[PDB]
Write a protein that binds this DNA or RNA. Structure first.
Ligand SMILES: [Zn+2]
Ligand SMILES: [Zn+2]
Ligand SMILES: [Zn+2]
Lengths: 56, 119, 228, 147, 65, 137, 56, 49, 230
DNA sequence: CTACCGATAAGCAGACGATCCTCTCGAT
RNA sequence: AUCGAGAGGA
């Protein structure tokens, strides 16, 4: 994200979310977790397609 | 490597053998020109490389707000003012070494503790 | 602003890493094949080998890059002047054909006139530079999903596409009512009725719909809640 | 592993290096072609020491010269000798090869074909990088030991 | 849409308290907490009844016909 | 004082500044105004001229109806919805006809209008006018 | 847990420095590659592991 | 109230909890074409149909 | 997102003209091997020429956009290390507004350009309903940015918790990142503006597992309400 | 000792792509 | 009534 410097490899820079649903996500964390969540929705939509065909 | 061009045509100069005298001659095949070679080195490959590591390290590099700034001393401008980055040689098997620029004398130094370095 | 000519240029580096004879050829619109780049560069204006590389490799010390272009020079050794370079492409009348393609179809942004070349010639050099800078594994392949490289088309740009088509079909129709008036009948419906159809259906096309732009651009709003 | 002779860890390393496929390309730093006409002498000062020897227990002025990464010459158990004989037995009787000692300052292999000959030596170095199997079974790329 | 009669959850009549509430807020410049308290709305279900309420009827009345 | 820095609170002041000036569907409206004000004039000039008939300054009315057998009514969104009509202004252009001498004003269909754009009646109505017009404020 | 929150915090925090150190290591070219993988691949592996363990 | 189901207070429903109006509209016109064939709005009866 | 917009598309031709009047050899006069440092200049993907000393070119260009004299929706991307300066007047580019952080006071040492003074005049205008968004935009207090330009800037997240300096903690609060980069060019107007219209209704979304948040935005649309007054 | 073939590699083509369901809108 | 398209449910 453009709130970071270049060549930053630390946890928080690349998606580690020091916080818990109770404590609440930070802005950055919120976004990263969003990116992760999307990836989950995507292949759930893709799995059901794939397996629906396998079954047939 | 380094290779050269015709003085007249301005075309690529292809090497050829003297035979009789045992020396190496570049010649152009557009016109006729011919010169003696400066090095014996004709061709070179490099697979493990260095060039393109320090890459576009240029005066205004200080003004770039997206480069991080460390606390290192500099080997010559004993200043503590520097910007840094990883090898610009964007390739799967490059090291993770940092390169620093002494925002005071533009001296380029490295975080590396194994390798010799002449930039 | 005005006219949409999507003619795509490819500059493509042949032969893999490990494979020798790494030629660089290019794709030209209308052109039946792919031409070694040094012919393109002649065909433009630039003839001497060393000036061509000057236009490509912006550094005298970059031996690796230069090295990569050695097989390109040999690639265009059979051709040594503007008139024969242009000739490869495509009587004699085929030289004319090429001289147009370079100025009408080859990189139409920049210019589309006559007196330039030098600008199209530097840009090709820039493309090549950028391609090589990548085979040399010194800068990465391009992120095809970088939002700064995408554009959203809205009401204006959509309607403007449509209007052009409609207004040209109107304009072509007056050239036809001009002919039959051998010795004022402007069909306003074309523009009225055409614009309705695309806004009525999703079909951003008017009676074509083969154009899958039909993807319902324009659909029936939605008022279930203020938030929806 | 052999039912032996099954948990003998070092005996298992032997098998790995026997199968993990190794190309010459994967050990070379750089390759160069030089014009060096004196079969008996070198324009390159670095070598020279190397040239006297390898006459103990016709050619061409075109020298092909490789440099091998000492670092990655241990990550696989590779001796200059194996690397040489390997090259040697490929071209058998039309490439004359010499090389540096295993523990010298730099690791180098020098070869000469045994005109239009500037171009043939360059095609060789294609075969040399992309076709010499040092050891191991082709296809078997990376190989891990596990317990 | 007008103050509902009778809190949903409990049944206490709140439909007669909309006027007074608007006045305790504007006229005596009070705060919704002590406004609600003074109107005799203690259980927080009835409190939500008036505090949440949006009076859209005003905007409906604004259409001429 | 007033030279002082800002706290995170003060940023809603600014989001309020935004929105007050752009609203929520600005990117729709700005696309349309650009099309009407400028781009529409251009499409006219291009292959436009004929071979001799040439085109010029384009005029866009305020939306109206053509009440078949009767008057041109000025048309409002509410009525359009109810009468299943198209809320759309007419297009007029200057058409010159140069008959050489040798060598050797005009209706052009109807453009549907985006509501609450510059060309639409609602674009500068006060809230009380909107209630009068039955469009929701 | 009041006390438990402090533990969890000082537990992530160790895995923070543990990643620091490895990074600091890799930047000084003293990181060795695990047989058959890239220098940078092994770093990612180490870091991702120190962080999953941290969470768990 | 198991498996993503829920229990609702009937008393508080009666007092108006989560009530909605529902409107539907139906449209019609007389005829599409003809100079001597128009459809009619009328309360129809017999006549041979 | 809430606060984002789309470029309408201005005319390039004043800029091209202005450029070749502030240095910049055109392209046909350019000789590479004798002026290699020259940052090359692009407008809309057209390479018009080169320019030695681009850090003043760029500094003028930016001061002109922030004056208003160059359309605020034009984006200007100087790439220091790639020796490139690219200007886009292309229509249809998405962009979002943000605060302009500027070197102030002493050669530290950044501040926001908006002050308490500015905020008061905005609220003066709100309550008496003089000083508007455009006011902020014309006095260079706020800026527009598209992803491309986003590439070359350092953005803060909150004025305070992202730069007051350094000199105890509440255990209930979410754990912060750092300052750790002190070379800001811009600041977020507010992080919550990353969200669209639907996800804006979700209360505490930062306490939810993300796919749920997506689900709620599917359902907010299906909920009975009062779609209009009329 | 040049040609003929049966033969192994190099190269553009395509028919699929979760089930059921509900509604509405334009065009004919 | 049918053809297409779009929105949406598990
Ligand atoms: Zn010559
Ligand atoms: Zn220094
Ligand atoms: Zn109650």
């Amino acid at each position: 994200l453009p709130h970071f410097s270049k060549d930053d490899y630390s946890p928080e820079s690349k998606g580690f979310v020091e916080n818990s649903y109770l404590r609440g996500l930070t802005p950055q964390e919120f976004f990263f977790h969003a990116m992760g969540g999307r990836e989950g929705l995507i292949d759930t939509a893709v799995k059901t397609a794939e397996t629906g065909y396998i079954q047939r | 490597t380094t290779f050269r061009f015709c003085r007249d045509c301005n075309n690529m100069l292809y090497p050829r053998e003297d035979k009789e005298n045992n020396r190496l001659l570049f010649e152009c095949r557009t016109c006729s020109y011919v010169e003696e070679a400066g090095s014996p080195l004709v061709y070179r490959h490099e697979l493990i490389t260095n060039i393109g590591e320090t890459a576009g390290v240029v005066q205004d590099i200080g003004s770039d707000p997206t480069l991080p700034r460390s606390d290192r001393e500099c080997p010559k401008c004993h200043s503590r003012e520097n910007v840094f980055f990883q090898s610009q040689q964007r390739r799967k098997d490059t090291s993770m070494v940092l390169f620093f620029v002494c925002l005071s004398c533009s001296h380029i130094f490295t975080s590396d503790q194994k390798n010799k370095r002449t930039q | 602003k005005g006219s949409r000519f999507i003619s795509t240029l490819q500059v493509k580096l042949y032969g893999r890493e490990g494979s020798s004879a790494r030629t660089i050829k290019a794709t030209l619109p209308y052109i039946k094949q792919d031409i070694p780049i040094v012919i393109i560069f002649r065909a433009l204006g630039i003839i001497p080998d060393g000036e061509i590389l000057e236009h490509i490799c912006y550094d005298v010390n970059d031996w690796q890059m230069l090295e990569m272009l050695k097989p390109c020079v040999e690639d265009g050794f059979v051709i040594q002047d503007r008139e024969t370079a242009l000739d490869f492409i495509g009587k004699e009348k085929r030289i004319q054909y090429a001289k147009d393609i370079l100025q009408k179809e080859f990189l139409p942004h920049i210019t589309q006139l006559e007196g330039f070349e030098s600008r199209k010639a530097f840009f090709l050099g820039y493309m090549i530079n950028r391609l090589l800078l990548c085979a040399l594994d010194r800068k990465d392949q391009d992120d095809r999903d970088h939002f700064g490289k995408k554009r959203l088309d809205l009401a204006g740009p959509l309607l403007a596409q449509l209007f052009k088509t409609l207004f040209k079909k109107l304009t072509k129709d007056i050239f036809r009512y001009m002919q039959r008036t051998v010795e004022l009948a402007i069909n306003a419906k074309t523009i009225t009725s055409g614009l309705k159809y695309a806004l009525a259906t999703g079909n951003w096309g008017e009676q074509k719909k083969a154009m899958s732009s039909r993807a319902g651009v324009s659909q029936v709003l939605n008022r279930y809640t203020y938030s929806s | 592993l052999e039912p032996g002779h099954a948990a003998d860890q070092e005996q298992a390393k032997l098998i790995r290096s026997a199968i993990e496929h190794t190309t010459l390309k994967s050990v070379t730093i750089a390759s160069e072609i030089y014009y060096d006409p004196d079969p008996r002498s070198t324009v390159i000062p670095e070598d020279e020491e190397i040239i006297q020897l390898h006459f103990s227990l016709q050619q061409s002025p075109w020298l092909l010269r490789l440099e091998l990464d000492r670092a990655a010459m241990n990550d696989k158990d590779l001796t200059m000798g194996q690397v040489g004989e390997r090259i040697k037995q490929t071209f058998k009787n039309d490439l004359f090869v010499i090389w540096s000692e295993d523990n010298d300052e730099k690791l180098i292999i020098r070869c000469r074909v045994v005109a239009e000959e500037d171009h043939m030596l360059k095609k060789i170095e294609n075969t040399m990088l992309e076709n010499i199997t040092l050891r191991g079974v082709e296809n078997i790329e990376r190989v891990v030991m596990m317990k | 849409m007008i103050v509902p009669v009778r809190c949903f959850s409990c049944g206490k009549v709140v439909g007669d308290k909309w006027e007074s509430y608007l006045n305790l807020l504007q006229e005596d410049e009070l705060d919704e907490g002590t406004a609600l308290s003074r109107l005799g709305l203690k259980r927080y279900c009835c409190r939500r009844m008036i505090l949440t309420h949006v009076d859209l009827i005003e905007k409906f009345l604004r259409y001429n016909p | 004082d007033e030279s002082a820095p800002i706290t995170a609170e003060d940023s809603w002041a600014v989001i309020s500044a935004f929105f007050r000036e752009k609203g929520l569907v600005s990117q729709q409206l700005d696309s349309f105004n650009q099309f009407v004000d400028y781009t529409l004039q251009d499409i006219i000039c291009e292959d436009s001229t004929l071979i001799e008939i040439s085109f010029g300054k384009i005029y866009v009315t305020k939306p109206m109806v053509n009440e078949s057998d009767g008057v041109t009514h000025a048309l409002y969104p509410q009525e359009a919805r109810l009468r299943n009509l198209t809320y759309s202004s007419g297009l007029f252009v200057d058409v010159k006809k140069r008959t050489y001498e040798a060598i050797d004003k005009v209706f052009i269909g109807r453009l549907p209008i985006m509501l609450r754009s510059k060309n639409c009646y609602l674009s500068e109505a006060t809230e009380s006018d909107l209630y009068k017009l039955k469009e929701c404020p | 847990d009041g006390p438990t929150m402090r533990e969890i915090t000082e537990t992530i925090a160790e895995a923070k420095k543990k990643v620091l150190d490895v990074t600091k290591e890799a930047q000084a070219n003293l990181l060795t590659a695990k047989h058959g993988m890239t220098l940078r691949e092994s770093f990612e592996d180490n870091v991702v592991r120190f962080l999953n363990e941290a969470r768990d | 109230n198991q498996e993503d189901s829920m229990i609702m207070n009937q008393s508080s429903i009666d007092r108006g909890l989560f009530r909605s109006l529902f409107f539907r509209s139906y449209m019609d016109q007389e005829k599409k074409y003809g100079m001597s064939i128009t459809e009619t709005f009328e309360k129809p009866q017999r006549t041979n149909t | 997102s809430l606060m984002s917009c789309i470029s309408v598309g201005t005319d390039p031709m004043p800029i091209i003209t202005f450029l070749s009047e502030w240095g910049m050899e055109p392209l046909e006069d350019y000789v590479p091997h004798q002026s290699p440092d020259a940052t090359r200049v692009f407008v809309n993907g057209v390479w018009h020429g080169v320019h030695r000393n681009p850090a003043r070119l760029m500094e003028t260009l930016r001061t002109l956009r922030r004056k208003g004299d160059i359309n605020p929706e034009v984006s200007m991307i100087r790439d220091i290390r790639e020796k490139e300066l690219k200007i886009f007047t292309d229509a249809g580019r998405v962009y979002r507004p943000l605060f302009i952080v500027e070197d102030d006071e002493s050669l530290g040492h950044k501040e926001l350009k908006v002050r308490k003074g500015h905020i008061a005049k905005l609220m003066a205008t709100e309550y008496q309903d003089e000083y508007t968004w455009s006011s902020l935009l014309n006095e260079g207090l706020v800026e527009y940015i598209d992803a491309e330009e986003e590439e070359s800037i350092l953005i803060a997240m909150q004025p305070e918790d992202l730069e007051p300096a350094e000199a105890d903690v509440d255990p209930a609060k979410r754990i912060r990142v750092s300052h750790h980069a002190t070379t800001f060019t811009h600041c977020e107007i507010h992080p919550s503006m990353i969200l669209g219209v639907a996800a804006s209704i979700i209360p505490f979304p930062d306490h939810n597992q993300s796919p749920r948040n997506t689900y709620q935005s599917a359902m907010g649309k299906q909920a009975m309400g009062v779609f209009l007054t009329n």
